[PDB]
Ligand binder design. Structure first.
Ligand SMILES: CN(C)[C@@H]1C(O)=C(C(N)=O)C(=O)[C@@]2(O)C(=O)C[C@@H]([C@]3(C)OC(=O)c4c(O)ccc(Cl)c43)C[C@@H]12
Ligand SMILES: CN(C)[C@@H]1C(O)=C(C(N)=O)C(=O)[C@@]2(O)C(=O)C[C@@H]([C@]3(C)OC(=O)c4c(O)ccc(Cl)c43)C[C@@H]12
Ligand SMILES: [Cl-]
Ligand SMILES: [Cl-]
Ligand SMILES: [Cl-]
Ligand SMILES: [Cl-]
Ligand SMILES: [Cl-]
Ligand SMILES: [Cl-]
Ligand SMILES: [Cl-]
Ligand SMILES: [Cl-]
Lengths: 195, 195
């Protein structure tokens, strides 16, 4: 079938859902494409090249709140952005694991640039602006990884693990998202006072 | 050489540092032990069994602030516990990736039980107590994963990525750790008031 970038990524993302990250190979991507391995090699040099492209394409396709609404509070932007990132990570099997170990692609540099600028415009230094955004990203990544991977107890543990499996991680994630944002705001608001 | 659990884990953890999680195999653990694969199979049934045991052993060996000091504020406990967890995850190559996809082993049930109880004793419901501890765990896991895996820019991005690589993730992690704990405290302190 067709072997333009878009077609190669469609098959590879569909295969990822079948196989996971561990069992995804170039040879079986060739299978799905109705093609021989050396044909595919022309288009994609190996598994590392492929995952890199899938990581970039998972953001472009499905992370659609990368940018603040005109007038949006910084708080609300980190909220919506966190939720979008999570959902984009959740849309494919092992998607957090696909995302792990890549930086933003050229194509989105200006988007991470705008995110960082937007924060500095709301009273953050570039550093504290970065730390808050990184924090959102690491909390969000960790919660999706744990969620996606979880796919004689003592009393409080038995009851805690019933509360963890009673959804897809959403409740726990959104509660701790609010703790993080308020924590940032408490930092922001104090300026140079001891807090 | 000796094939008691402790010896098998010592070699496997040392091999993990050589190889990573991807390239760690039973066959090469047999190599390191001066033994044949079928001998090792008696002791360890496969790679999944091994990683499960390495995940448990990474905590037992190196995560030594699993418990509050008598009199410790809940804040300070989450701090020290977060730092310890991080450091235990950082001590081996792909240690976050080894930890991902296991729950606490029997051996530490009472420790996670005590953690949860301790929080309920300081004004948390079991749920909000769980959400704060899970949040610490997901933030901490995500920051180590990103750190351990990172092993024409626009101006703010160029400068942000210089600040991210200027240490091992410690600065960014500890700053966002404090945002999280204060965020929790703002939640705790409000009781039933709108906040
Ligand atoms: C979830 N969001 C907060 C961010 C985001 O909106 C995007 C995105 N492309 O829209 C990201 O790339 C993010 O999801 C994201 O993962 C990147 C991350 C950050 C700060 O930017 C970086 O360039 C960068 C990096 O190179 C290494 C680590 C980290 Cl945490 C980063 C910013 C993330
Ligand atoms: C880093 N610490 C906050 C915790 C901790 O001290 C320990 C530990 N053995 O000492 C953990 O197991 C932790 O590091 C840890 O990873 C577990 C985690 C928790 C709430 O307990 C669970 O039993 C559990 C679970 O089954 C699934 C997900 C999560 Cl987040 C959890 C608690 C973590
Ligand atoms: Cl074609
Ligand atoms: Cl195309
Ligand atoms: Cl708003
Ligand atoms: Cl939220
Ligand atoms: Cl022996
Ligand atoms: Cl032993
Ligand atoms: Cl204290
Ligand atoms: Cl801290």
């Amino acid at each position: 079938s067709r072997l333009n970038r878009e077609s190669v990524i469609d098959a590879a993302l569909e295969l990822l859902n079948e196989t996971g990250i561990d069992g995804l190979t170039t040879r079986k991507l060739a299978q799905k494409l109705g093609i021989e391995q050396p044909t595919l090699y022309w288009h994609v040099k190996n598994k590392r090249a492929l995952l890199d492209a899938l990581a970039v394409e998972i953001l472009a396709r499905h992370h659609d709140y990368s940018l603040p609404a005109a007038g949006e509070s910084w708080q609300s932007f980190l909220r919506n952005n966190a939720m979008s990132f999570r959902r984009a990570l959740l849309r494919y099997r092992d998607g957090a694991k696909v995302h792990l170990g890549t930086r933003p692609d050229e194509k989105q540099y200006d988007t991470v640039e705008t995110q960082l600028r937007f924060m500095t415009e709301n009273g953050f230094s570039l550093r504290d602006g970065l730390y808050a955004i990184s924090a959102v990203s690491h909390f969000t990544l960790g919660a999706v990884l744990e969620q996606q991977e979880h796919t004689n107890l003592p009393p409080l543990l038995r009851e805690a693990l019933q509360i963890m499996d009673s959804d897809d991680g959403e409740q726990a994630f959104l509660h701790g998202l609010e703790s993080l944002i308020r924590g940032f705001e408490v930092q922001l608001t104090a300026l140079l006072q001891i807090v």
